[PDB]
Amino acid sequence: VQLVESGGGLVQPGGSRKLSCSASGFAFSSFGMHWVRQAPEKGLEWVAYISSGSGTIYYADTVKGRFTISRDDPKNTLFLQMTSLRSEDTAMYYCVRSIYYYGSSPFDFWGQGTTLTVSASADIVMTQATSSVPVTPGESVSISCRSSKSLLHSNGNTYLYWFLQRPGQSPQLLIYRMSNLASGVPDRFSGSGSGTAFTLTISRLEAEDVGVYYCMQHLEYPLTFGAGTKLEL
Amino acid sequence: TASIAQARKLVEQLKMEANIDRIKVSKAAADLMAYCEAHAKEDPLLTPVPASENPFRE
Amino acid sequence: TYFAVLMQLSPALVPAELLAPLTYISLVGCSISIVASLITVLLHFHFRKQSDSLTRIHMNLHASVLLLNIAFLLSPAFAMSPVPGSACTALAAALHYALLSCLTWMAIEGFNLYLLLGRVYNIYIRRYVFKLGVLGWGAPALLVLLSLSVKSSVYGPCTIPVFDSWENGTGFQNMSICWVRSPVVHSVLVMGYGGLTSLFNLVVLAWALWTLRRLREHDTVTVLGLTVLLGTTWALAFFSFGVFLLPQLFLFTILNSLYGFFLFLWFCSQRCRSEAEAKAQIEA
Amino acid sequence: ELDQLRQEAEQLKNQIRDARKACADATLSQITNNIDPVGRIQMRTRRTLRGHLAKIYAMHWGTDSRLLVSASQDGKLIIWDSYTTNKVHAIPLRSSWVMTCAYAPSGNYVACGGLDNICSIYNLKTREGNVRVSRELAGHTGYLSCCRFLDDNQIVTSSGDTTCALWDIETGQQTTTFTGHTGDVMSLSLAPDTRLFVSGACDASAKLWDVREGMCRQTFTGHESDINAICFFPNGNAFATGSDDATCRLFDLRADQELMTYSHDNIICGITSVSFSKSGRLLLAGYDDFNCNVWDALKADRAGVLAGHDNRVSCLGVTDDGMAVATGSWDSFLKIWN
Amino acid sequence: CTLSAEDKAAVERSKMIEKQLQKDKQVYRATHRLLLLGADNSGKSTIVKQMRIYHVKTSGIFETKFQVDKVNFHMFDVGAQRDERRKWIQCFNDVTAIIFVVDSSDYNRLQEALNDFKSIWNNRWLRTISVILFLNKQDLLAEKVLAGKSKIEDYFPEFARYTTPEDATPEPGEDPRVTRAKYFIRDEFLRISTASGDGRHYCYPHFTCSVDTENARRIFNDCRDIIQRMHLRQYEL
């Protein structure tokens, strides 16, 4: 599976720009799509979400009317129009795959991303530790996160997601619902939570686990990320 | 004969089945009843689980 | 009042001695009807079947006939002194709506028969029963709510004059039944509708007989049930002429007040035949 | 002689019958007559699952006791979230006529099969979200009656020929073939210890096999008509058998003998599915007369009737935790009774 | 609301699945499932290939698709199963019609074809299902009755005591002694048809040659009659 994005570049303030995500290698019709921003130095922030059938479309408060999303299913593409792009939008954009059912794993594949540079609210805020945790290979890392609201729904699921982003490619899913492990990540990762405070534990550190670790809540839209905790070698 | 080839398999199979130790029906009945009575609490179908911990309410 | 007042050209002539036997005939026939549907609706739910696309139309027709018989008896009730002004204008609208809904549902039964026997193969529509319910209830509502505001002096109290050969001089009092008092709607929405629908039902009945004869080349009990389900006794309201005093007044009443009872008989017979088929397929 | 060994086979049959009689000291009624009754059992359709277009034949609960795969004649396997009455997946089949449906213990694959002589294995969890057929097991010369999963790489299939077959999915060829029936096998149940399995055929006989060499251990002959359903006891040392004699028969492996028969006077319809409860006290059998009966497995008493169904009850299965029992009938309805 | 975002998206997925189910329910209801049965000598395999012009090794069901007058059918042929069809045939309790194809060329094993038709007719599951009987390859029968090598009276004794039926409508170009045997087979099958019909189902005899240049309009008309009677049974009282 791959998600290649087209768009980005230098755009003057107040202009309009169209960004496209071409999905090759999976069923685009049955999958929801999300757009995730990332500032040049800061962390991630959710932007927009379109569902299967274009019947449930959500936006972030900061992009409530400026951006519009639109999925073209027959040729497997997802566009968004960006109107009135101010300097706060100078972020790289990621086309994130998702699917929703019992046992499903949302936020599986993240596209490479395109850089869009603009020239010169009871959200569930998630807080992490400082983005500097000195850890050496072979040890156990104990990253922690805290939620403003208890994510334990009446169903019995704590809608928590832990992602990893290496200094290169786009972030990939590590654990979902604080306990379930991703499809491809090793068993060294684990997650333990109580509803408000959560811990991602790496029982054994390798050289490929260096990066920035990001949080997600999914109890209700919008989706809040957090600053992100960084591991350095 | 073609038929005797199939016939000689049945005699061997019955010989294999006959040489099997069989316990008394009383012992098997006692063991079966013991299993039924032992795990009697862990059966939502026997005792109707209250509508606070069974996942098929409403 | 008798049942024939609902649809007539302008006979308004009863020998004034047969009115009391006639009205009482209309009194009990609706009464035996007013329960016959109520139990039938009871039998459809306490003994619910697989919800066939045909029996749903029968239940809807039963509901329409029950509404008609429950709105007919209460027009004389709301034609008396304790009526808050235009209180029974709503009841006149309800009675006209019930008549139009019953006729439209008869036309719907005709269309269903044509699809089931004439257009044999392609009969499936997305939700057929819903598109028939809308056409049988709300479609004869865009004709009553449309006229409720436009020329609003169309419903309201009505006093149809009954007279013998002596013009009812110094005799009795004419019956009061609040109905469509404008003799303009009574030729385009009541009798026009009953000539558009009863003619269709008669056409489908002749076609049903022809295709049933070609299909068999009991055969009479099915046609007798079909002439009740489609509604052909309501075709009797075309013979209100001077010579035919007896049929359009007495035969019409005695055959249409008990229309709910006849429909209940049809439903019970169909249910018993279904039970017989189920027993045949269980024991064999 | 050509008929010489027939006399020897008859002598062996008489010997095994005499052994069964010698091991027969007291019936199950005589042993469980001093046990209190289960009481009058009532269950209601907590959730009814609509969406199938034609008659439902097969179902199978998952290990998690929440996901339910059901097979219908329109050519569809629908995976239902029984708690929320949702449709996780709607797999369209190649052959509209499907008799059997399985759900792997790991929850990764669903096996379908029918009159196409093919056991199609569908990979539920794939990088692409669509459920694609993993492999189409072929090699059966008859309609597949029951496909059951051993693990993610082995599957036991009872088909319309006088054979059962254990397949290795990865290789795609029959790992072993169990022969010895003289009629088509119509049902199959695997013991909890993933080592033995009983197959019921149209011979009025149920045979217990062993999946390590492929030779049958014991045969049980107590029925008159064909066998449509079979199910091991939760203990693993007894199994039930549903037939068209309007009788459900519980046999035991250790005694190699009939234990008990469930048959009431006003039941003249066959049994289409039999499943034990978690404790094994309740034997739920879905009959042809539009309903199900919950027999007391230790008293032979009709201790419960499940009513609502508009047609023949085809599939019937309890959950692993024993919370609910799901009955799928020919009117495209799945009912989750509790 | 009352349920989480993931459950909302799961409900949306279920709604999409139900939409697809509604879309293909139309196709399911429009198509008329047809069963096809016959002996090895009967040329059902020839028919299911000759009608295609106008419109895996051990596989069990072969599916044929054809539409007449914008009405689409689905014929199923059973090819790789055992002799005993008692168990699987119950899966065809809802098929519109059964097409029983009989080889009339061979005179021997016609009695077993009659027995097979009788077993099909009296089956409990197959009750209330009609049969469009096709006496196939009449060309071979016409050739053989003029060949003179074999006689009907050797296999059937009632042929000599059977005059041609008065309702026969044969082409005048054929020998009038051919139609005697041509309708004798039809009468033999129709006795079994009418022995226990009793109104739930009927047989629809036909005579079919090798190709006939058309064989689907007969099925169209016959299935129209069958569905018409099925619909009329809702008003039968």
Interface chains of chain D (3 or more CB pairs under 8 Å): A, B, C, E
Q: Please indicate if any CB of chain E lies within 8 Å of the CB of D100.
A: no
Determine phi and psi for D162, rounding to 5 degrees. -85, 50
* E to B contact (≥3 Cβ pairs closer than 8 Å): no
What is the enclosing helix (H) or strand (E) of C275? helix C259-283
Q: In angstroms, rounded to a whole number, what is the distance separating the alpha carbons of residues C268 and C266?
A: 6
Dihedral sign computed on CA atoms, order A50, A51, A53, A56: negative
Q: In angstroms, rounded to a whole number, what is the distance separating the alpha carbons of residues D198 and D213?
A: 15
How distant, in Å, are the alpha carbons of D57, D75, D119, D146, D317 from that of D98?
A: 7, 7, 10, 10, 18
Using an 8 Å Cβ cutoff, are E36 and E99 in contact?
Answer: yes
Which residues sit opposite A47 in a β-bridge? none
> Where does residue C10 rank: exposed (0-12), middle (13-18), buried (19+ CB within 10 A)?
exposed
Q: In angstroms, rounded to a whole number, what is the distance separating the alpha carbons of residues D206 and D332?
A: 30
Q: In angstroms, rounded to a whole number, what is the distance separating the alpha carbons of residues D232 and D198?
A: 8
Test C212 with E22 for CB contact under 8 angstroms: no
Q: In angstroms, rounded to a whole number, what is the distance separating the alpha carbons of residues D307 and D293?
A: 9
Chain D residues closer than 8 Å to B29 by CB: 26, 28, 31-32, 259
Chain D residues closer than 8 Å to B14 by CB: 9, 12-13, 16
- Judged by DSSP in three states, C26 sits in helix
**Within a 10 A sphere around the Cβ of C55, how many other Cβ atoms?**
18
Which residues sit opposite A197 in a β-bridge? A146
Q: In what order do the strands lie in the sheet with A133-134?
A: A133-134, A229-232, A211-217, A160-165, A172-176, A180-181
**Within a 10 A sphere around the Cβ of D48, how many other Cβ atoms?**
12
Hey, what are E49's tokens?
Answer: 């290939």
**Nearest CA to D330 among D286, D297, D268?**
D286
Hey, what are A120's tokens?
Answer: 């010169």
Residues in contact with C283: Cβ distance below 8 Å, sequence separation at least 6, in sequence order: none
Q: What is the DSSP letter of D181?
A: -
Residues in contact with D235: Cβ distance below 8 Å, sequence separation at least 6, in sequence order: B31, B32, B35, D280
Q: Write down the residue that tokens 């069964």 correspond to.
A: D20
Residues in contact with D257: Cβ distance below 8 Å, sequence separation at least 6, in sequence order: B22, B25, D20, D23, D24, D220, D251
Residues in contact with C77: Cβ distance below 8 Å, sequence separation at least 6, in sequence order: none
Q: In angstroms, rounded to a whole number, what is the distance separating the alpha carbons of residues D302 and D263?
A: 9
The total number of residues written for chain B in this structure = 58
Method used to obtain the model: cryo-EM
Interface chains of chain A (3 or more CB pairs under 8 Å): D, E
Test D129 with A183 for CB contact under 8 angstroms: no
Q: Write down the residue that tokens 């013009």 correspond to.
A: C167
Which residues sit opposite A146 in a β-bridge? A127, A197
Dihedral sign computed on CA atoms, order A73, A75, A78, A81: negative
Hey, what are D97's tokens?
Answer: 């006529």
Alpha helix positions (H), C138-190: 145-149
What is the distance between the terminal CA atoms of chain E, rounded to a whole angstrom?
51
**Within a 10 A sphere around the Cβ of A86, how many other Cβ atoms?**
10
CATH code: domain of residue C99: 1.20.1070.10
| Amino acid present at C276 | A
Test E91 with D99 for CB contact under 8 angstroms: yes
Q: In angstroms, rounded to a whole number, what is the distance separating the alpha carbons of residues E44 and E62?
A: 11
How distant, in Å, are the alpha carbons of A152, A202, B24, D282, D284 from that of D28?
A: 50, 57, 12, 15, 19
The total number of residues written for chain C in this structure = 284
The separation between CA E235 and the C-alpha centre of its own chain, rounded to angstroms, equals 27
- Judged by DSSP in three states, C249 sits in helix
Q: What is the DSSP letter of A185?
A: S
Which residues sit opposite E76 in a β-bridge? E35, E63
Q: Which CATH number fits domain E31-235: 3.30.420.270, 1.10.1040.20, 3.40.50.300, 3.40.630.10?
A: 3.40.50.300
The separation between CA D3 and the C-alpha centre of its own chain, rounded to angstroms, equals 37
* Nearest chain A Cα distance for residue D64, angstroms: 11
Q: In angstroms, rounded to a whole number, what is the distance separating the alpha carbons of residues D223 and D261?
A: 10
How distant, in Å, are the alpha carbons of A37, A156, C228, D109, D151 from that of D71?
A: 44, 30, 43, 14, 21
3-state SS record for chain E: CCCCHHHHHHHHHHHHHHHHHHHHHHHHHHCEEEEEEECCCCCHHHHHHHCCCCCCCCCCEEEEEEEECCEEEEEEEECCCCCCCCCHHHHHCCCCEEEEEEECCCCCCHHHHHHHHHHHHHCCCCCCCEECCEEECHHHHHHHHHHCCCCHHHHCHHHCCCCCCCCCCCCCCCCHHHHHHHHHHHHHHHHHHHHCCCCCCCECCEEECCCCCCCHHHHHHHHHHHHHHHHHHHHCC
Test C116 with E231 for CB contact under 8 angstroms: yes
Determine phi and psi for C257, rounding to 5 degrees. -65, -40
| Amino acid present at D146 | C
Test E232 with C120 for CB contact under 8 angstroms: no
> Where does residue A171 rank: exposed (0-12), middle (13-18), buried (19+ CB within 10 A)?
buried
E11 vs D86, D138, D141: nearest CB: D86
**Nearest CA to C265 among C229, C216, C218, C215?**
C229
- Judged by DSSP in three states, D141 sits in coil
Test C50 with D269 for CB contact under 8 angstroms: no
Using an 8 Å Cβ cutoff, are D111 and D147 in contact?
Answer: yes
CATH code: domain of residue D118: 2.130.10.10
Chains C and D: how many Cβ contacts under 8 Å? 5
Using an 8 Å Cβ cutoff, are D270 and D244 in contact?
Answer: yes
Resolution of this entry in Å? 3.3
Q: In angstroms, rounded to a whole number, what is the distance separating the alpha carbons of residues C261 and C33?
A: 5
> Where does residue E116 rank: exposed (0-12), middle (13-18), buried (19+ CB within 10 A)?
middle
**Nearest CA to E138 among E75, E169, E183, E100?**
E183
Using an 8 Å Cβ cutoff, are E85 and E2 in contact?
Answer: no
What DSSP line would sit under D213-276, residue for residue? T----EEE---SS-EEEEEE-SSSSEEEEEESSS-EEEEETTTTEEEEEE--TT--S-EEEEEE
What is the enclosing helix (H) or strand (E) of A214? strand A211-217
**Nearest CA to D112 among D66, D161, D74?**
D74
* Nearest chain E Cα distance for residue A30, angstroms: 8
Maximum separation of any 2 CA atoms in chain E, in Å? 86
How distant, in Å, are the alpha carbons of A54, A70, A139 from that of A26?
A: 18, 19, 37
Test C50 with D331 for CB contact under 8 angstroms: yes
Please give the tally of structural domains in chain D.
1
Test E82 with D142 for CB contact under 8 angstroms: yes
Residues in contact with A117: Cβ distance below 8 Å, sequence separation at least 6, in sequence order: A8, A9, A10, A11, A90
Q: Write down the residue that tokens 């003029």 correspond to.
A: E146
Between positions 69 and 98 of C, the ones with CB within 8 A of E are: none
C284: nearest CA partner in chain D:
D269
What is the enclosing helix (H) or strand (E) of C106? helix C87-117
Q: In angstroms, rounded to a whole number, what is the distance separating the alpha carbons of residues E237 and E234?
A: 8
Q: In angstroms, rounded to a whole number, what is the distance separating the alpha carbons of residues E62 and E74?
A: 10
Test A100 with E3 for CB contact under 8 angstroms: no
Residues in contact with C5: Cβ distance below 8 Å, sequence separation at least 6, in sequence order: C160, C175, C177, C179
Provide the residue range defining the domain that includes B49. Answer: 1-58
What domains lie within chain A, and their CATH numbers? 2-118 (2.60.40.10), 126-231 (2.60.40.10)
Q: What is the DSSP letter of D122?
A: E
What DSSP line would sit under D80-115, residue for residue? EETTTTEEEEEEEPSSS-EEEEEE-TTSSEEEEEET
How distant, in Å, are the alpha carbons of C32, C51, D129, E107 from that of C45?
A: 21, 10, 43, 58
Using an 8 Å Cβ cutoff, are D83 and D52 in contact?
Answer: no
Provide the residue range defining the domain that includes D185. Answer: 3-337
- For chain E, the domains span 31-235
Determine phi and psi for E85, rounding to 5 degrees. -105, 20
Q: In angstroms, rounded to a whole number, what is the distance separating the alpha carbons of residues C81 and C83?
A: 6
Provide the residue range defining the domain that includes C112. Answer: 4-283
In this structure, the strands spanning A16-24 and A2-6 are antiparallel
What is the enclosing helix (H) or strand (E) of C278? helix C259-283
**Within a 10 A sphere around the Cβ of A10, how many other Cβ atoms?**
11
**Nearest CA to E155 among E110, E187, E188?**
E110
In this structure, the strands spanning D334-337 and D45-49 are antiparallel
Q: In angstroms, rounded to a whole number, what is the distance separating the alpha carbons of residues C212 and C227?
A: 14
**Nearest CA to E189 among E84, E111, E136, E127?**
E111
Angle of CA points E2, E6, E10, to nearest 5°: 95
Dihedral sign computed on CA atoms, order B14, B20, B26, B29: negative
Test D12 with B23 for CB contact under 8 angstroms: no
Chains B and D: how many Cβ contacts under 8 Å? 158
